[PDB]
Amino acid sequence: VLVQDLLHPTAASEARKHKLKTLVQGPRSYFLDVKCPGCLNITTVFSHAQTAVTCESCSTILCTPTGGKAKLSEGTSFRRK
Amino acid sequence: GKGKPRGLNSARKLRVHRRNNRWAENNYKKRLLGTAFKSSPFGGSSHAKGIVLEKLGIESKQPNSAIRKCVRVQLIKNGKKVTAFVPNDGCLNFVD
Amino acid sequence: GRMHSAGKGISSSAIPYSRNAPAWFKLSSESVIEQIVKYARKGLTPSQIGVLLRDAHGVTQARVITGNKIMRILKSNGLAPEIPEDLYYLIKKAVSVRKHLERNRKDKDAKFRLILIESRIHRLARYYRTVAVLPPNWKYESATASALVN
Amino acid sequence: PKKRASNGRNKKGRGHVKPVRCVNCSKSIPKDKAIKRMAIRNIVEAAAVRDLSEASVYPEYALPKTYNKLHYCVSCAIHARIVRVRSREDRKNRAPP
Amino acid sequence: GRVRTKTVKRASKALIERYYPKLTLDFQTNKRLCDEIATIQSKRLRNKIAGYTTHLMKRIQKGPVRGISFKLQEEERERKDQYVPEVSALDLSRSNGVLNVDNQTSDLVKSLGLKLPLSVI
Amino acid sequence: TRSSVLADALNAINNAEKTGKRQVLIRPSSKVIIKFLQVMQKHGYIGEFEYIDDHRSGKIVVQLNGRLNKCGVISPRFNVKIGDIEKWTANLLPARQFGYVILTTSAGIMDHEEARRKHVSGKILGFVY
Amino acid sequence: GWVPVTKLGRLVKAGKITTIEEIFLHSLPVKEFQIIDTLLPGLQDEVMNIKPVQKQTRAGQRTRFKAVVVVGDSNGHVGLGIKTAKEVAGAIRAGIIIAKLSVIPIRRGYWGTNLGQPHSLATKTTGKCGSVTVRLIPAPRGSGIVASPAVKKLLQLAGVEDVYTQSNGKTRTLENTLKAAFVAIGNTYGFLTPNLWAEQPLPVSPLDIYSDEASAQ
Amino acid sequence: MRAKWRKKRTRRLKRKRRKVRARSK
Amino acid sequence: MENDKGQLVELYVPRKCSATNRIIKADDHASVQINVAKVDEEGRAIPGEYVTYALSGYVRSRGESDDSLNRLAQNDGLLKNVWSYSR
Amino acid sequence: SLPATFDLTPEDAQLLLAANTHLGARNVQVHQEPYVFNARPDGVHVINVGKTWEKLVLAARIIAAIPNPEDVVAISSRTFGQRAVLKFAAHTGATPIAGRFTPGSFTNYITRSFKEPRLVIVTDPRSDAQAIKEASYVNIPVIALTDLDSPSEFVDVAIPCNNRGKHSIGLIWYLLAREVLRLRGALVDRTQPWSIMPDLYFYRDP
RNA sequence: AUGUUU
RNA sequence: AGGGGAUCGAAGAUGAUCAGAUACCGUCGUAGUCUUAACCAUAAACUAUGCCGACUAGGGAUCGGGUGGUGUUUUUUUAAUGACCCACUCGGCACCUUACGAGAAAUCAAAGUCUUUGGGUUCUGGGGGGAGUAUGGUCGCAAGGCUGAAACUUAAAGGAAUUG
Numbered sequence A: 001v002l003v004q005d006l007l008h009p010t011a012a013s014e015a016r017k018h019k020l021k022t023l024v025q026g027p028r029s030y031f032l033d034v035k036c037p038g039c040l041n042i043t044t045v046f047s048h049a050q051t052a053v054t055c056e057s058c059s060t061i062l063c064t065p066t067g068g069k070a071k072l073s074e075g076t077s078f079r080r081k
Numbered sequence B: 001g002k003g004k005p006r007g008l009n010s011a012r013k014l015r016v017h018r019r020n021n022r023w024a025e026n027n028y029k030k031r032l033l034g035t036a037f038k039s040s041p042f043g044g045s046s047h048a049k050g051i052v053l054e055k056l057g058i059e060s061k062q063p064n065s066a067i068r069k070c071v072r073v074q075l076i077k078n079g080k081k082v083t084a085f086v087p088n089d090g091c092l093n094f095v096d
Numbered sequence C: 001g002r003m004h005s006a007g008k009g010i011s012s013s014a015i016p017y018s019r020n021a022p023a024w025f026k027l028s029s030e031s032v033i034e035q036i037v038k039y040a041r042k043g044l045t046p047s048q049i050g051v052l053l054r055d056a057h058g059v060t061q062a063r064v065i066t067g068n069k070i071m072r073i074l075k076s077n078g079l080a081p082e083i084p085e086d087l088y089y090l091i092k093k094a095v096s097v098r099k100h101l102e103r104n105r106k107d108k109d110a111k112f113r114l115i116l117i118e119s120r121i122h123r124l125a126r127y128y129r130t131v132a133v134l135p136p137n138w139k140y141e142s143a144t145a146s147a148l149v150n
Numbered sequence D: 001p002k003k004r005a006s007n008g009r010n011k012k013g014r015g016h017v018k019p020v021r022c023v024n025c026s027k028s029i030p031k032d033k034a035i036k037r038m039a040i041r042n043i044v045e046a047a048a049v050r051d052l053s054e055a056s057v058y059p060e061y062a063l064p065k066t067y068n069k070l071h072y073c074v075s076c077a078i079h080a081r082i083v084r085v086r087s088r089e090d091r092k093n094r095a096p097p
Numbered sequence E: 001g002r003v004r005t006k007t008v009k010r011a012s013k014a015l016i017e018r019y020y021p022k023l024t025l026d027f028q029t030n031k032r033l034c035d036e037i038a039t040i041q042s043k044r045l046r047n048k049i050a051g052y053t054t055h056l057m058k059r060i061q062k063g064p065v066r067g068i069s070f071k072l073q074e075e076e077r078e079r080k081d082q083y084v085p086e087v088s089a090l091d092l093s094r095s096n097g098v099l100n101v102d103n104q105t106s107d108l109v110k111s112l113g114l115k116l117p118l119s120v121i
Numbered sequence F: 001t002r003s004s005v006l007a008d009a010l011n012a013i014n015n016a017e018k019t020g021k022r023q024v025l026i027r028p029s030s031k032v033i034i035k036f037l038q039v040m041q042k043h044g045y046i047g048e049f050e051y052i053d054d055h056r057s058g059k060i061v062v063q064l065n066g067r068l069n070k071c072g073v074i075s076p077r078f079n080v081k082i083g084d085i086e087k088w089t090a091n092l093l094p095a096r097q098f099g100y101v102i103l104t105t106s107a108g109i110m111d112h113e114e115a116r117r118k119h120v121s122g123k124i125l126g127f128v129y
Numbered sequence G: 001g002w003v004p005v006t007k008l009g010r011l012v013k014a015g016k017i018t019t020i021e022e023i024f025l026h027s028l029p030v031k032e033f034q035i036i037d038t039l040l041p042g043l044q045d046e047v048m049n050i051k052p053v054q055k056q057t058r059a060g061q062r063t064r065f066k067a068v069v070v071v072g073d074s075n076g077h078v079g080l081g082i083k084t085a086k087e088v089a090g091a092i093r094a095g096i097i098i099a100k101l102s103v104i105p106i107r108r109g110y111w112g113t114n115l116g117q118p119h120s121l122a123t124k125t126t127g128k129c130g131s132v133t134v135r136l137i138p139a140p141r142g143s144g145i146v147a148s149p150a151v152k153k154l155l156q157l158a159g160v161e162d163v164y165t166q167s168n169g170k171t172r173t174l175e176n177t178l179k180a181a182f183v184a185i186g187n188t189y190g191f192l193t194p195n196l197w198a199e200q201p202l203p204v205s206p207l208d209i210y211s212d213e214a215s216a217q
Numbered sequence H: 001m002r003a004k005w006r007k008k009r010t011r012r013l014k015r016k017r018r019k020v021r022a023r024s025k
Numbered sequence I: 001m002e003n004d005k006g007q008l009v010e011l012y013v014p015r016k017c018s019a020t021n022r023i024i025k026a027d028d029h030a031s032v033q034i035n036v037a038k039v040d041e042e043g044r045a046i047p048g049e050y051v052t053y054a055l056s057g058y059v060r061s062r063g064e065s066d067d068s069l070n071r072l073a074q075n076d077g078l079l080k081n082v083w084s085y086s087r
Numbered sequence J: 001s002l003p004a005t006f007d008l009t010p011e012d013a014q015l016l017l018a019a020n021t022h023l024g025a026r027n028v029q030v031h032q033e034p035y036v037f038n039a040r041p042d043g044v045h046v047i048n049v050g051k052t053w054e055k056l057v058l059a060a061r062i063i064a065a066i067p068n069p070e071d072v073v074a075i076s077s078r079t080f081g082q083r084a085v086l087k088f089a090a091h092t093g094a095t096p097i098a099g100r101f102t103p104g105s106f107t108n109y110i111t112r113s114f115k116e117p118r119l120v121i122v123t124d125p126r127s128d129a130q131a132i133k134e135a136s137y138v139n140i141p142v143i144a145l146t147d148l149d150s151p152s153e154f155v156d157v158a159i160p161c162n163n164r165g166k167h168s169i170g171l172i173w174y175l176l177a178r179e180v181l182r183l184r185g186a187l188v189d190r191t192q193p194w195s196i197m198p199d200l201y202f203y204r205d206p
Numbered sequence K: 001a002u003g004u005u006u
Numbered sequence L: 001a002g003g004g005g006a007u008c009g010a011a012g013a014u015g016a017u018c019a020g021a022u023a024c025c026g027u028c029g030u031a032g033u034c035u036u037a038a039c040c041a042u043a044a045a046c047u048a049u050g051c052c053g054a055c056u057a058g059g060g061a062u063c064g065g066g067u068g069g070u071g072u073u074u075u076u077u078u079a080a081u082g083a084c085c086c087a088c089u090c091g092g093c094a095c096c097u098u099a100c101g102a103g104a105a106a107u108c109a110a111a112g113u114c115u116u117u118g119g120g121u122u123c124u125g126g127g128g129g130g131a132g133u134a135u136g137g138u139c140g141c142a143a144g145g146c147u148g149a150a151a152c153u154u155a156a157a158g159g160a161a162u163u164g
């Protein structure tokens, strides 16, 4: 090499690098609108949620905490915003 | 770093470390302890008068030969007994 | 890193470059503040308040959304604890380690860990006394450690 | 100098390894340093296999094997030629022969 | 043993390197011209050199051997060419007039060349 | 821990220049680093450099042109008198005709030539040649 | 005569290349000493030292003789040759050959102002061989060569008239000291100064300009 | 002599010196 | 390097590597000068007319001479899609 | 800068694809090769044949820039490329080195050896490392037919191609010779397919 | 298996 | 100081060798080896490589976590985990090649970024002995640990490597 664009690296390389080792560091996590069994609100759930998030007006589990990304109880839909 | 403080306010530690480590030098340690005054029968002097006590033949170390004809002398200054070589061919007849 | 360990782990949160609330977030700043106060009155520390806010709600950062940090909101609303959260949990950990040491007395590893935890506690308390968070005569005492957190 | 790039043993990130006794002389040698050879032999080595197959009351007996892990100290391994002195470059070769 | 030394092998090699349009593969006529094209100082050494030259000539007609360059190996190297003629350079054949490549090779071709018979499957 | 961001930046630049790279990314790219880079650029030892404004302390990408033999810091930032500027230049620079000892003075960060023609002094920051 | 090989030598004999500066500019490898002889006629040599090196073999003392030779005119050019041979005279002659083949240019400069005919080095330079480090520092006019006798002889055969020297390591190893000094001398043209920043048009090698000098008719 | 055995001889000498000094007062 | 009254007193103004801009020394025998023949009117490779590149022995030893020459050639023409600034 | 006639035509493009030049090294590759088109499964990488063609054209122009044709030396110790370099040095005026390099051929001016090339082209840098080393000892530019796992040290012009396939090696050498002749003037028009087929360069085991 | 000094 | 004391086993006793052999080898065998409560604080306590931080080659393995896949395999009933493959990533034990570089070399991705000498900081050494001795202090029940000279003596001692 010895010559490259350190200011405009390829998007593939930036997605390959660690979240802290990108050109400008940023989170690789996100939020999802989970389709609740009820209504009146669409619950927003963190992807790497440490909590077993329940519905706002119910008691059904939307996610189960894991090491990284949380589970989704195996019945749900989720919009990625 | 190099194993020593570089900070602008580390002059005390630098000079104390130098003071401590100067003791490992022979000349500095001898000078600061005054070894020549107590030890070294010539009490910090270049020359010393004495009275010859005995002619001795001291055999030279290996691989040499030819015993060196020194003299045991009692120094007038402090009474200590030292051995002095008599350097020339002969010259032991010149001392009694 | 790892002030009392050999680890060099870099795992940490990488907050986004954006200092403004996400577009998809529609909840009011006063609403999320009210939920923060509700959780605090329920007894949650700022760490668990932020965890619940980001897990079960859509609030990404309380600073970027409400213009104020969670602990600052609690102090302004008069819910600040007697001692800071991190110091309180360090003291609780020390109390647990000491309570295990009393009943074991042979866990030299536990004694070493108690020494490490108490050193961290003393350094944190020194910092807090310096910034006047704790009283200038505040002192952590092992014989009275438990009574300060329970 | 340092003869071997790591050591005359295999211990990095370990610190201490429990010892084993040499099967030949009973010298205590750390387990990571001891020369370990698996001996998997037929019970009847080579010659009496025919005689034991003839004398066997079972057709196709499929005679068993003796398994034995031998741990040697360096001196005994060299004396018994389980390992040999190698050239300086040949020492940097960990593949078995 | 009947191994031949340097003074025989090198002398035979040079004799071939300078006298190829010369002595055939018969030792009797190989030793005769050795006396006129070489100043050998013993008939036994002459016979040894002639015998090795005969052997080398008998084994040169069945494939060039190392270290023998008498300015005719290049002429024969140029004369022997086109091992498999008149059929194809492996172009537009051995298939349905196409190239049997993969999908990734198909994108490689479509990068610049839109005219190429491809059978990506 | 990190004790001199200018030292880290100049060491990264030195390693890139001696490995032949024509660009170098330095972090956290403080204002002292920016001023030092600007002096080097004004004297032609480095090319264009980009400040990448993350909402952390920031980053910089410098373009190197192969004219930099060595850039380095002098740590600690020794106080330098006007008469001591000559001694520092004699010790650090390869020759009296080129090379610059950079000082942080109350008149700003500047090379020793500018400092002595402004008749100002301060603390030594580093050198470039 | 010469009867050259190494077509650079053929060009030098034919007179197409007239100065060693072209060879230095194009980094042409020199393999015959006659090229250096014809391009630098006034190249004086000096034997720095001859020492016996002994190989122990079956009553030992193979006792070959190693000669260090410094060649050069006192204008911009020196070469260093270290060579061992069975006899002192042959070692000296082969060392002279090797030094001529190793002749390199030196960049002289000014300590202070630009008053012509440079007297010192352009920059501080360092050479290292073995444990010996030789540092050459530009010096004002009239300073002379402040160096040990061997390094001073090498520098005065290089044409430097004012230079300071600093040495570290076992300088009594004369071969290593001379090699380090030679490396320091050679680095003078490898140190890029601002006055060499200007781009040059990368001229065409003489091996291309005069290309019909490699053939056998 | 082996450095270990020199150390052991020196330790025995030190013990003997300690005993002979303790016996005096 | 000129003296007073501006005459060149220095011999052997040296060549510089086209990739790293460092001086090609007289003993830099790993260095290389590459001539690329110019093309006129669909080929015919005009002799004596080249685009000239100097590559240092350091670059060639590090094995970056290929990439550096690709970049320099593409910058001067001579090549269309080989070297990319982003990678 | 090269006119439109110099770009990769469909004829030699399909020639390269038939000879399998694009089948580069396995998922292990030297990290100095941007000649890699996206990797296909089963490990084999796809070499950008367009970049291969442009590198070949640049190498051909560099060879044509040499004043004396005999000053060009083509080297191949591997059997797959010995006939290719022999054909290259038969068509062009280059000097061939097929088989052993006799280390000391660029230094060590003893006879039976000691050519002084102005340019050296090697079939495989790994198997012809000695020639590359000697060229780096005596300032000789190097063109090499390099796979994706070939060493790039002292390789001035890399031509990315499959150096495991005899067809690919012979075709690359054939294209080098053809482009050199076109640039010199032996082939008056660079549109004809150079009727003599690129099988004169392929190795023959039987 | 052992074989002491120079 | 208690308990326990199978095995091995400083000491000791013995058999044999030897010129002598209360050494190696053989047979016993006390303390010890094991444990509780207290000391001791020393090891070639070693990677003979202080700790923190940044940068400077390539590569394949492997441990732990995570991310993704038209992934293979296991059944619960969509899927999911479990195991495995591929790729990436963070952290770790290491390894292979090459070293721009470093070194006296052996060798070293650090032992590099050092006469082009300065990121921060702690400790240690100043030729070999005398000597880790004497003395004083201090700790220990003791053995000893920590601190630690001097007189005097000596031209080498030592490190890496080469050939015999």
Ligand SMILES: [K+]
Pocket: B063, B064, B065
């Ligand atoms: K004598």
Ligand SMILES: [K+]
Pocket: L005
């Ligand atoms: K017992």
Ligand SMILES: [Mg+2]
Pocket: C001, C008, C009, C010
């Ligand atoms: Mg860190």
Ligand SMILES: [Mg+2]
Pocket: C003
């Ligand atoms: Mg700490």
Ligand SMILES: [Mg+2]
Pocket: D001
């Ligand atoms: Mg040894």
Ligand SMILES: [Mg+2]
Pocket: D015, D016
């Ligand atoms: Mg240990």
Ligand SMILES: [Mg+2]
Pocket: K006
């Ligand atoms: Mg003797």
Ligand SMILES: [Mg+2]
Pocket: L024
């Ligand atoms: Mg015995």
Ligand SMILES: [Mg+2]
Pocket: none
């Ligand atoms: Mg100790």
Ligand SMILES: [Mg+2]
Pocket: none
């Ligand atoms: Mg130690």
Ligand SMILES: [Mg+2]
Pocket: L127
């Ligand atoms: Mg000493």
Ligand SMILES: [Mg+2]
Pocket: none
């Ligand atoms: Mg030794």
Ligand SMILES: [Zn+2]
Pocket: D022, D023, D024, D025, D026, D027, D072, D073, D074, D075, D076, D077
């Ligand atoms: Zn054993």
